[PDB]
């Protein structure tokens, strides 16, 4: 299980396909520049006036209110 899909991705070690030391993530709706997105950053639009999903600060995945 690689953490990045492309060897062009600077978040991973070219030699391992896994995160470089200190990188929190390589991919995901709540990853930016190899770091978890800040808590509260919008990461998925909900239909209508339902609350949009937001990042946790602690994961690269966008959690669900639905």
Swiss-Prot record:
UniProt motif (Cell attachment site) ranges: 47-49
Paired cysteines (S-S): 2-17, 4-12, 11-34, 25-31, 30-55, 43-62
Superkingdom in the source lineage: Eukaryota
Domain Disintegrin: 1-66
Its biological purpose: Inhibits platelet aggregation induced by ADP, thrombin, platelet-activating factor and collagen. Acts by inhibiting fibrinogen interaction with platelet receptors alpha-IIb/beta-3 (ITGA2B/ITGB3).
Protein's name in the database: Disintegrin rhodostomin
Organism expressing this protein natively: Calloselasma rhodostoma
């Amino acid at each position: 299980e690689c953490d990045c899909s492309s060897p062009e991705n600077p978040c991973c070690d070219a030699a391992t396909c896994k995160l470089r030391p200190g990188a929190q993530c390589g991919e995901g709706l709540c990853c930016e520049q190899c770091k978890f997105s800040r808590a509260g950053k919008i990461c998925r639009i909900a239909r209508g006036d339902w609350p949009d999903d937001r990042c946790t600060g602690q994961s690269a995945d966008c959690p669900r209110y639905h």
